[PDB]
Amino acid sequence: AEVALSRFSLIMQAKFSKIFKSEINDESINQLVSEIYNGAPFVKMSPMFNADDD
Amino acid sequence: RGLNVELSKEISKRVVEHRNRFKRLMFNRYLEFLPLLINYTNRDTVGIDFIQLESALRQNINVVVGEARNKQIMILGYQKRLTKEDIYFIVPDYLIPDDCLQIHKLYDNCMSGNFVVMQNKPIQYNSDIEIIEHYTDELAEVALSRFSLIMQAKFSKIFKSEINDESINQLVSEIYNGAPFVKMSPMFNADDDIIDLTSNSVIPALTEMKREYQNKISELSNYLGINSLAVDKESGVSDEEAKSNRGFTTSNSNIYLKGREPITFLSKRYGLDIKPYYDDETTSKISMVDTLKDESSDING
C-alpha cells in the first residue's frame, strides 16, 4: 500500500510549468501570447536581459 | 487596389495557418476514412452496398437489413419488448415487404422473418467523433511544434567586418567560388571574426518531436480499433517496442465487430455465411505472396 502511495505521490507532483519572470503589469504577457503558445518563431525583444535566463 | 503588407512576421501567421489547417484536415480525414473498416466477406451473395451501410452506422442510426424480394435491401430502423411490424421508417420505394416482418434475434435462432437491426457499438456511452476531436487538437499543436522547429532550422555564415568593401571581395572570390588558400591581413581578420549561427539546439530536438507525433498517431489509432495488430503477432515485436499494450488494442477492435454481430443472426436465417471480419489488406504483393496457380500470373503479369 505504501509503495502504491509513493508511486501516486510521485506522478502527482511530476507536472511542469514554464515560469516567466518579469515586472508585472503587461510587459511579457503579450510576448507569450502572440509568440509562444501561438507557436511563433523569431520573437524580437528588448536588450534588457529579457530572456538572459530570465 | 488596396495593399500594405504587414512585415516578414507574416510567417507567424503562416505558422498558425499550418496548425489550423492541419487540425481541420486530420479531423475530417479521420472521419472520412472511419466508416469503412469491416466490410465483412464482401458481397458473397447479398445485395447490400456495404459502404452505404457503414457510413450509416457511424452516424449511429440503427439500420435494419431484412428481405425485400428475398435479396436483403437495407432499411432504417429507428428488459426486452419485441419489435415485429414495419412501424419503422422505410427508405426504399416499392420493395417493401408489405407482409409479416420480425426481428430475427431471440424469437428463435434461425426461423423468423428477417428484419434485424445492427448497432454501431453494442453498448453506447460516448460517440467517437468526440475522441477524434480529443486527440486532433493535441496532435495539431505537436504538428505546430514540428513545423515551427524546421522553419527556424536554417543557417547562415555571418561575416563581420567594418562595412564598405573589405570582406566582400574575400567571400566572392574565395569562399563560394570554392577557393582554398585565401590570404588575409594580420588584422585578426578571421580570428573568430567570421562566425556561424548554428541551430544545434534544434536538430537533436527534431527527431524526438517526430517520435511524439508518431506515437500520438498510434495512441489515437489503437483507440478506434484501427491497428497493426495481426502482423505484429507474426513479427514477434509484440510488446514494449510497439508501445501500444496489445490487450487494449485487441480490446477496442473487438467492440465494433460484436456490434455488427446481428449480420450473423441474419446469415443463419437464409443459409449463407457472413462473418464481420476486420480489414487489414493491401494488394498486388500480398496477393502475390499468398498465391505465388498459374492463372494468377495472367491476371497481373
Binding site: 503589469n25 503587461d26 504577457i29 503579450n30 501570447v33 502572440s34 | -
Partner: protein, 46 residues
C-alpha cells in the same frame, strides 16, 4: 420657425461613431494579449 438645432449639431458627431464603429478591421490589428484583472473574492465581500 427654423429653431431648435440641438437635434442637429449632434448629427456630425452621431454619424462619426457610426462611421468609425464597424469599419475597423482593415485599419487596426488583433494582437498583443491585453491582460484583464477583474475582481476576486475580496471585492465581492467589499
Amino acid at each position: 420657425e427654423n429653431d431648435f438645432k440641438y437635434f442637429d449639431d449632434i448629427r456630425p458627431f452621431l454619424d462619426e461613431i457610426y462611421k468609425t464603429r464597424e469599419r475597423y478591421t482593415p485599419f487596426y490589428d488583433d494582437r498583443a494579449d491585453y491582460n484583464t484583472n477583474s475582481k476576486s473574492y475580496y471585492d465581492y465581500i467589499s
